[PDB]
Amino acid sequence: KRKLIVDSVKELDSKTIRAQLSDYSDIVTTLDLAPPTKKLMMWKETGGVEKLFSLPAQPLWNNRLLKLFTRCLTPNLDEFLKEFENPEVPREDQQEEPSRLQES
Amino acid sequence: LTRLEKDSPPVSVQIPTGQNKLHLRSVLNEFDAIQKAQKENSSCTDKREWWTGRLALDHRMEVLIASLEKSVLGCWKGLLLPSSEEPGPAQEASRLQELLQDCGWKYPDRTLLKIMLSGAGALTPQDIQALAYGLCPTQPERAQELLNEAVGRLQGLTVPSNSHLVLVLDKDLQKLPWESMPSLQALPVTRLPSFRFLLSYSIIKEYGASPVLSQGVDPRSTFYVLNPHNNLSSTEEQFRANFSSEAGWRGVVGEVPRPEQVQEALTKHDLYIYAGHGAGARFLDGQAVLRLSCRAVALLFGSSSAALAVHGNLEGAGIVLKYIMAGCPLFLGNLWDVTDRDIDRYTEALLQGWLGAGPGAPLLYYVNQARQAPRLKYLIGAAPIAYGLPVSLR
Amino acid sequence: FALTFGLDQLKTREAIAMLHKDGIEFAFKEPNPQGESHPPLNLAFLDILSEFSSKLLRQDKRTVYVYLEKFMTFQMSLRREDVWLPLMSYRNSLL
């Protein structure tokens, strides 16, 4: 089992070469733009759920009131066997005539 | 193991388990360990503690029943499963000798190649491996390769017929549940004391005796003894109208039956359903049973009702070994201790299954079905065993 | 929702067991009006309840099976029909 990774394909087809030369519409992409307005910039700042769960809903600007809010941000089968029926009881207790000979 | 059959030469082999992982004493000691655990848990009050123990013992018994099939019998369950009497084994009953003997076989027997062909699809490749290595020592290539390719070529060959089975076990192998073995589930399986019993059954069956095996179990000829002592309220509560409304039945509930009445049941009627403690060795001892002829199938549903207690090196002892001597056709009794609700479920299942099936209904088939009624399907579901010859309705 | 409950084994056994309990009790809640010879209502749910089976280990699977026997009944266990397909699937899930 010589793992030489020897494969017959060690070149390229000229058909594939020209196909790559012409069809360059699969390697390019579109443009990723950044927030186009301020409101979207803000919502990218605070829209993350980590900030959504660590900030007031009604915006409070003063750090005093922000502290007033954020200080409230803090950090077997036994029950199933209760439904079972009462124990049962076990099915265990846990507790020739001599003949008449004819007289002589 | 000896598979004796008509027009069949004796096929006998060994199955040493002292070289494997689950030795033949490990199983027989785990059975006793589970029995002691059950006896200990029998007096627990906490529902949480009691139910934990039952559910921890059912798993162990389930493990054990499969050990017998996985470790002890090994590549020889085909010798227990009905052998294929079809003219299909013959193609190899001499083909796998002319090479197996050449590869190293010492004693080239010829029946071991026909007792296994039935259910050829059910034959497994690892089964084949042992069947090959043992049959073929020395040269390791042909030894397996030939047997494996030959058996593979013969797969899904045919379908099995009906052939009742009368397994005989010794003084210590009688208590292990050998009926639930995941190869003997569908087939009808009983257990007789010996072989002369099996043939005396035919003698009695030919001289117009043992009427049950001649006509059948009349569904209007059953006698029941329920709750001889006022201790089990759940039983009476469940089986009161069901055991009373039954057409043409008679029995006793609450009061301890008098000796005359119980002797009459086993002698005059055809079926004896016992619901109580033990086997009623208090109201009918083996002594009274031997002093009468048994014309009724015994369905005795109480703890260790069919258990031959091995009180030392001595052989078994119990009521079953004295019903069979009276001519009892079949004998259904539990092997280990049982509780109320599970064995009541088993009894209700079997009775409705057998007495609702209709005329000509094997009892063993509906037992194999009623085994799945108990909640713990391996600790109160695998207990009922059968002693005797197959019984049925008319 | 079953993938969310990863097997931390930190009492995740009780959570998934109490989850199955609720499923069973909801499945066998309302008997069917047509007749008791027909499947219990809301039984197709057990097919959904099957996705949570893998979360239990073997012992809890057996315990939930025994609690399933508290509403099944042997006759219904042996009852093999198309309307019982979901109950067969759930049983095979717990085995």
Summarize the structure.
The structure is cut from a larger assembly and holds chains A (104 residues), B (394 residues) and C (95 residues). Chain A is an all-alpha fold and 104 residues long.
Judged by helices, strands and strand pairing, the structural class of chain C is mainly alpha
Q: How many DSSP-defined strands of chain B?
A: 8
Gyration radius of chain C, in Å: 14 Å
Radius of gyration of chain B: 23 Å
The span between the termini of chain B is: 35 Å
Largest sheet of chain B: 6 strands, mixed
Distance N terminus to C terminus of chain C? 22 Å
Shape of chain C: elongated
Instruction: Quote the beta fraction of chain C.
Output: under 5%
Q: Structural class, from helix and strand content of chain B? A: alpha/beta
Q: Describe the strand arrangement of the main beta sheet of chain B, using strand numbers.
A: 4-3-5-6-7-8
List the quaternary state of the chains. part of a larger assembly
Order of helices and strands of chain B: EEHHHHHHHEHHEHEHEHEHHE
Function (chain A): May promote apoptosis.
Subcellular location (chain A): Cytoplasm, Cytosol; Nucleus
Organism (chain A): Homo sapiens (Human)
Region (Interaction with WAPL and PDS5B) (chain A): 1-75
Can you describe what's shown?
Chain A has 5 helices and no strands. With about 100 residues, chain A is mainly alpha-helical. With about 400 residues, chain B is of the alpha/beta class. Helix content of chain B is about 35%, strand content about 10%. Chain B has a 6-stranded mixed β-sheet. A two-stranded antiparallel ribbon of chain B has the order 1-2. In chain B, helix 12 (about 320-325) links the parallel strand 6 (about 295-300) and strand 7. With about 100 residues, chain C is an all-alpha fold. Chain C is built from 5 helices and no strands. Chain C is elongated and about 45 Å long. The interface of A and B includes residues 78 and 93 of A. It is classed as cell cycle. The entry lists the keywords protease, SA1/2, cohesin. Cryo-EM structure of human separase bound to SCC1 (310-550 aa) and SA2. Chain A is Double-strand-break repair protein rad21 homolog. The organism of A is Homo sapiens. Gene of A: RAD21, HR21, KIAA0078, NXP1, SCC1.
